[PDB]
Amino acid sequence: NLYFQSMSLQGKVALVTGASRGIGQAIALELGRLGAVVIGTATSASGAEKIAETLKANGVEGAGLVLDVSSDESVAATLEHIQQHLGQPLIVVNNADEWFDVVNTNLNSLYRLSKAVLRGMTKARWGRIINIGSVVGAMGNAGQTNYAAAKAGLEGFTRALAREVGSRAITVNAVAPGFIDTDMTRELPEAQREALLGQIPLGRLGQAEEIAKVVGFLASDGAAYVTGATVPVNGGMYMS
Amino acid sequence: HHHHHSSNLYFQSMSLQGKVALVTGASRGIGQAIALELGRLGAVVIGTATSASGAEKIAETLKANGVEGAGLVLDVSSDESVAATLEHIQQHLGQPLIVVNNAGITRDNLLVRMKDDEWFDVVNTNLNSLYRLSKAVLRGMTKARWGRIINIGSVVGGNAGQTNYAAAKAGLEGFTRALAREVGSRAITVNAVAPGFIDTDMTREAQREALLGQIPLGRLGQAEEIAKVVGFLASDGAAYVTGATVPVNGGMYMS
Amino acid sequence: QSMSLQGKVALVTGASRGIGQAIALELGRLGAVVIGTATSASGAEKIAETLKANGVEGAGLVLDVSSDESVAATLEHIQQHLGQPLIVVNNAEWFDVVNTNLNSLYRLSKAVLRGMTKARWGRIINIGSVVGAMGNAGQTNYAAAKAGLEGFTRALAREVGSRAITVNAVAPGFIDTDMTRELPEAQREALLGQIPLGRLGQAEEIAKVVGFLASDGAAYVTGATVPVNGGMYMS
Amino acid sequence: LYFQSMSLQGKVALVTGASRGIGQAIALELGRLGAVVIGTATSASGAEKIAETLKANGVEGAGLVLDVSSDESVAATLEHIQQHLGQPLIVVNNAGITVRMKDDEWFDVVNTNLNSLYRLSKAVLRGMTKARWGRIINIGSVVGAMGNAGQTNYAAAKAGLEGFTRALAREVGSRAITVNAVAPGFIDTDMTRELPEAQREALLGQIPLGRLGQAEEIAKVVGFLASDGAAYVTGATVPVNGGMYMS
Numbered sequence: 001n002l003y004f005q006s007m008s009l010q011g012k013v014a015l016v017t018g019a020s021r022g023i024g025q026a027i028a029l030e031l032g033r034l035g036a037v038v039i040g041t042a043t044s045a046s047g048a049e050k051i052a053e054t055l056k057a058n059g060v061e062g063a064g065l066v067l068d069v070s071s072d073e074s075v076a077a078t079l080e081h082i083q084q085h086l087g088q089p090l091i092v093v094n095n096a097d098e099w100f101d102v103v104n105t106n107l108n109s110l111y112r113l114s115k116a117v118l119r120g121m122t123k124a125r126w127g128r129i130i131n132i133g134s135v136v137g138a139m140g141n142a143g144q145t146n147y148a149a150a151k152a153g154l155e156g157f158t159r160a161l162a163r164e165v166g167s168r169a170i171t172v173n174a175v176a177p178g179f180i181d182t183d184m185t186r187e188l189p190e191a192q193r194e195a196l197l198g199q200i201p202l203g204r205l206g207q208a209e210e211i212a213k214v215v216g217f218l219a220s221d222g223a224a225y226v227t228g229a230t231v232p233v234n235g236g237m238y239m240s
Numbered sequence: 241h242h243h244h245h246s247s248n249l250y251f252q253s254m255s256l257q258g259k260v261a262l263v264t265g266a267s268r269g270i271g272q273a274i275a276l277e278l279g280r281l282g283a284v285v286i287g288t289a290t291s292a293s294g295a296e297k298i299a300e301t302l303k304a305n306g307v308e309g310a311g312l313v314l315d316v317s318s319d320e321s322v323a324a325t326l327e328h329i330q331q332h333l334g335q336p337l338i339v340v341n342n343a344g345i346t347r348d349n350l351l352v353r354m355k356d357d358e359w360f361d362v363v364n365t366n367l368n369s370l371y372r373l374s375k376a377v378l379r380g381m382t383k384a385r386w387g388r389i390i391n392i393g394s395v396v397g398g399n400a401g402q403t404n405y406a407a408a409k410a411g412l413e414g415f416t417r418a419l420a421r422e423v424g425s426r427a428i429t430v431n432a433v434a435p436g437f438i439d440t441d442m443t444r445e446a447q448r449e450a451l452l453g454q455i456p457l458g459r460l461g462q463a464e465e466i467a468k469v470v471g472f473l474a475s476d477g478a479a480y481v482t483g484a485t486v487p488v489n490g491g492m493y494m495s
Numbered sequence: 496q497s498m499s500l501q502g503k504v505a506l507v508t509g510a511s512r513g514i515g516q517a518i519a520l521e522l523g524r525l526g527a528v529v530i531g532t533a534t535s536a537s538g539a540e541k542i543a544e545t546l547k548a549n550g551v552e553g554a555g556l557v558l559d560v561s562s563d564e565s566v567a568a569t570l571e572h573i574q575q576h577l578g579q580p581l582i583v584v585n586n587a588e589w590f591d592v593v594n595t596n597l598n599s600l601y602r603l604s605k606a607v608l609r610g611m612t613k614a615r616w617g618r619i620i621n622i623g624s625v626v627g628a629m630g631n632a633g634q635t636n637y638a639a640a641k642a643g644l645e646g647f648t649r650a651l652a653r654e655v656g657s658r659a660i661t662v663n664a665v666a667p668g669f670i671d672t673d674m675t676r677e678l679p680e681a682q683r684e685a686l687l688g689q690i691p692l693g694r695l696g697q698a699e700e701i702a703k704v705v706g707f708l709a710s711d712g713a714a715y716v717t718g719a720t721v722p723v724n725g726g727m728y729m730s
Numbered sequence: 731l732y733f734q735s736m737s738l739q740g741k742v743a744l745v746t747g748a749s750r751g752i753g754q755a756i757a758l759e760l761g762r763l764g765a766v767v768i769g770t771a772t773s774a775s776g777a778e779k780i781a782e783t784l785k786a787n788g789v790e791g792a793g794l795v796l797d798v799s800s801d802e803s804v805a806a807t808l809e810h811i812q813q814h815l816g817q818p819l820i821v822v823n824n825a826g827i828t829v830r831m832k833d834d835e836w837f838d839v840v841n842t843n844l845n846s847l848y849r850l851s852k853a854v855l856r857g858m859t860k861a862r863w864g865r866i867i868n869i870g871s872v873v874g875a876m877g878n879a880g881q882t883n884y885a886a887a888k889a890g891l892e893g894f895t896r897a898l899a900r901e902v903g904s905r906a907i908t909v910n911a912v913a914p915g916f917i918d919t920d921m922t923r924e925l926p927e928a929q930r931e932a933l934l935g936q937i938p939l940g941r942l943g944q945a946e947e948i949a950k951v952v953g954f955l956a957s958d959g960a961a962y963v964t965g966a967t968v969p970v971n972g973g974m975y976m977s
């Protein structure tokens with residue numbers, strides 16, 4: 001029995017918002033790889049369709065749905081639709097001067113969705129909520145301001161919610177990417193990329209998959225005592 | 241008085257692929273659990289203790305659980321003990337590329353040498369031991385261009401307990417982050433795990449029920465729940481995580 | 496007198512009692528013209544009375560920081576009759592509470608920034624909430640509010656720095672006020688046990704920090720949250 | 731007798747590392763506020779310069795030779811101050827041991843520094859304990875280089891200092907001794923002055939205030955921390971960095 005525990009997710013339903021591209025897509029595939037039934041979502045019908053195509057292409061059971069996390073109606077309706085056709089999602093991954101509005105809107109959406117999925121986790125007496133922070137999204141001071149503020153909001157939010165729902169054996173954690181190989185870093189020249197790399201002790205951009213593996217671990221039974229945590233996944237580049 | 245006690249299925253969990261792992265403080269509790277989890281994942285595990293009987297218990301446990309490796313005597317406060325043990329491991333087993341520092345300078349170690357007992361002396365001596373051992377294992381990780389160093393914080397024990405616990409945690413976070421920066425370019429990750437209140441032979445002493453009230457999950461953590469995190473940090477999937485301190489405390493945060 | 500605020504106009508919200516009152520008096524003591532605010536006309540009148548009683552020039556006003564109209568109107572009133580306030584002190588379901596609070600900081604801060612921008616000088620100082628609430632809910636709400644305030648203050652500081660406007664915060668621990676003075680003896684005794692100084696802080700001890708942050712000597716301090724808690728750190 | 735907000739009349743203050751820059755500024759600010767100031771250096775010429783400056787600015791006190799790495803130097807200097815001046819109840823630790831800098835240097839520097847804080851702090855606590863009043867104030871090191879090594883070393887030093895200051899504050903609180911820290915960012919020094927026009931202008935871009943801090947701006951904070959008005963502040967690290975936060 002030493003070599004035999006689940007670190008797998010057979011029998012679980014997972015909702016991953018923002019799953020059509022990059023980090024979200026990678027998360028969807030990693031959870032599927034681990035045996036979950038995955039519902040990935042996008043804000044558009046073509047994005048939802050791409051998700052279903054990808055899942056099937058990689059042999060993952062589940063679906064692609066349209067979801068707008070800013071809308072109570074969209075949230076309520078989508079969950080009803082998942083409950084009827086697939087079951088309650090017990091693993092939920094929120095991937096979906098301006099800094100204030102962005103961060104405030106983001107955190108209101110986490111709260112809206114998190115609240116909505118908690119009834120079913122409460123009823124199962126088990127759950128995993130995992131919040132994905134935003135990747136370093138611009139090179140100057142505005143980028144650092146926005147990135148740091150978003151991270152701080154996410155850390156405080158995640159910690160509070162973890163406290164609120166702990167007695168129900170629901171964990172609530174966050175993953176805080178640094179510079180990841182996605183479309184903002186892809187659009188810098190070789191010289192600027194290598195200069196950014198000089199701030200990163202590992203000397204390379206992170207892969208989407210490297211975010212997904214952490215999320216996969218946080219979703220497992222082995223991470224059951226981890227809650228209210230924000231795991232930084234940034235190759236050693238710390239910016240706050 | 242022997243100080244070196246060594247010890248057809250293919251398990252899907254064996255991702256640590258014959259890698260050699262050194263886990264200090266492995267005779268008991270969290271350390272023992274870490275040794276077993278790394279073995280479960282297919283590493284060759286060298287667990288250490290400060291005594292020959294502890295080293296023997298480690299070898300006995302490893303064999304009992306089907307893990308290849310050994311139990312050794314190691315004093316992390318001593319340059320000689322460190323140098324010698326590593327040379328011994330290199331000759332007989334290979335270079336350890338996964339290193340887990342769980343062995344902490346006790347209060348009672350300093351006290352026998354007649355240096356002071358205060359938070360300062362404890363934390364300073366502890367962090368000097370992490371540095372000593374970490375430096376020693378870095379030559380072989382540098383040469384392999386791969387490595388994992390993972391530092392285990394101390395479990396929660398009045399105000400003196402809170403002072404010492406909080407100072408130790410802050411030292412560990414700053415230390416781990418700095419060392420991660422220093423060795424990053426070599427694809428060596430350096431991380432920490434910060435336990436909260438964990439079920440060990442020390443805990444079970446009304447106070448229990450009060451303590452649990454500070455823990456959102458309403459229960460003590462299991463040694464195994466620490467070990468799983470350490471195991472993940474050691475994996476290829478945690479390759480972009482470095483300089484991090486993962487708290488494993490059921491939601492109880494004490495600064 | 497490097498601590499002089501002679502010639503400056505200061506707006507201190509929530510000034511009719513406790514920490515807010517103490518802040519209003521400390522800034523006046525340092526020579527500012529102080530406009531203190533409350534949510535009611537009788538509160539505004541108490542503020543004017545107190546100021547006069549302590550020899551401080553300024554006024555008491557009614558202000559609801561949850562309302563764009565109240566904010567706009569009050570600033571217009573102050574600008575006409577007193578001048579632009581260049582020192583602003585914000586003293587006035589965890590989710591809804593913290594979110595609403597931080598929306599109010601933003602609303603007011605934005606509003607006063609036009610005049611600080613035009614003067615190319617400013618001080619914004621945000622006061623966190625005091626410890627003295629029951630159980631886990633009290634700790635949850637307190638910790639979330641503190642983290643929001645730290646992140647908010649740091650971001651805003653970054654946004655407005657180039658204009659020589661500093662933005663800082665003060666994070667009180669267990670302070671002697673009308674809200675804590677009659678907490679049950681068991682919670683009070685527990686709180687004291689967690690405090691290395693072994694005493695509750697005074698309102699004045701918060702006010703002195705705010706006063707220093709408002710001075711020219713604190714000009715290179717920005718985006719900081721100064722904890723004022725006798726050594727009790729709660730996260 | 732007298733009673734004022736920022737007055738340090740009647741207090742004796744020990745400021746280590748006082749012969750130049752931030753330390754010198756701190757010594758003068760405390761003197762300005764009425765303290766008797768003992769400033770220290772590691773050399774006789776540095777001690778001389780301190781006495782000369784104090785007298786030039788009308789501050790009572792002295793300049794002493796002190797090696798904070800040495801128990802004997804620490805013991806002896808405190809004896810000397812106790813005999814001739816009185817017990818120092820305000821103590822400001824600015825004295826840190828400063829192809830010259832890589833990212834591996836952090837350990838030895840920070841370890842040596844924090845051992846010296848502890849040594850000195852312990853030594854001055856007997857007199858503060860007996861007076862049932864005290865101020866210990868630790869000064870962090872200024873951002874000391876432009877690359878990753880500079881950030882590594884600076885961040886490590888800041889973290890050590892935060893943890894240290896907070897723990898010591900907890901240990902000595904019941905005695906009405908406060909223990910705080912000041913964490914400078916980029917301050918106007920010979921390290922910022924050496925660097926070319928392009929590097930200077932780039933550096934300032936990381937600082938929201940768009941300028942280097944002055945030594946005096948650090949000294950004003952220290953002065954406030956030393957006052958009776960800061961009596962409920964303890965275990966705090968006040969960052970003084972114009973909005974540039976690196977950890």
Ligand SMILES: COc1ccccc1NC(=O)N1CCCc2ccccc21
Nearest residue numbers: 364367410411414415840841890893894
């Ligand atoms: C928070 O650090 C401490 C608090 C109380 C006692 C000792 C320490 N720190 C300490 O001994 N080291 C070891 C020396 C370099 C260092 C660098 C970053 C963090 C910790 C440390």
Ligand SMILES: COc1ccccc1NC(=O)N1CCCc2ccccc21
Nearest residue numbers: 103104153156157594597642643646647
């Ligand atoms: C940690 O902060 C929170 C905890 C619980 C709910 C909301 C928040 N944060 C929050 O409302 N804002 C306001 C929105 C911009 C923001 C930026 C940095 C830190 C906090 C916040």
